[PDB]
Amino acid sequence: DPAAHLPFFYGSISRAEAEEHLKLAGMADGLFLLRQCLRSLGGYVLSLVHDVRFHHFPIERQLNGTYAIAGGKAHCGPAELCEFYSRDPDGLPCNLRKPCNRPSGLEPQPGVFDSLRDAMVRDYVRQTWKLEGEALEQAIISQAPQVEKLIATTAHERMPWYHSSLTREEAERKLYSGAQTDGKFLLRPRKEQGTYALSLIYGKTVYHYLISQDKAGKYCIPEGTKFDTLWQLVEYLKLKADGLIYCLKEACPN
């Protein structure tokens, strides 16, 4: 990871434990850390403390391999960006004054998605070109440019909760027929091609949330958080409530 070497990079930690580290580190103005963005690919999040309050600024990776906060200047890397903002707040509540370094012995938190992608890539090369051992590991180095991006976008397509060709009625039928537990959900595509539907049960009723993607390629529910992939979308709404009546929990059969 371009940020692994940075001592204030915490990897894929949630906002909650991110704020716990900033709290343990003194909550001084300009106290900051870096963590992986769970909504975008190759993106980061700048967690910042000002006036004893937490400020979280998404850093999304541009098409040309640079990094930028929305409506802010671009930088060649996380190292550069933090170096820049250390001397010019240029939008932030204040400059980055003191890095919230990882405790001794603690390394960046490995991400769920990145490990899933790693296994899917290795699985693709395995069944396609019939390779094993180091001969497979070497093939993954060269055969991970486009497919790495393709497997990420299509990760949901291989997931249990994803249903290939179900209408609203077909979904509601077996949804009830089961444990009827809260949070039991599923995902499915729709007629408008670039849209999907998130169906789940909560207490009494089957709810349905319209998912649409705006070009730039980012999926979202109207007036909701935007994701780069449907997999990240579903995984985000498992822990964070984020608008839903009830966060996702369990899945339906394949």
């Binding site: 910042l48 600024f57 906060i69 939008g91 709810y207 349905h208 319209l210 109207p222 958080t225 608008g243």
Partner: peptide, 17 residues
């Protein structure tokens, strides 16, 4: 008949000026 999101419980991120 799609359900509107609760605009009051969306997770909010900060932005520049």
């Amino acid at each position: 008949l799609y359900n509107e999101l609760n605009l009051g419980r969306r997770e909010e991120y900060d932005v520049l000026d």
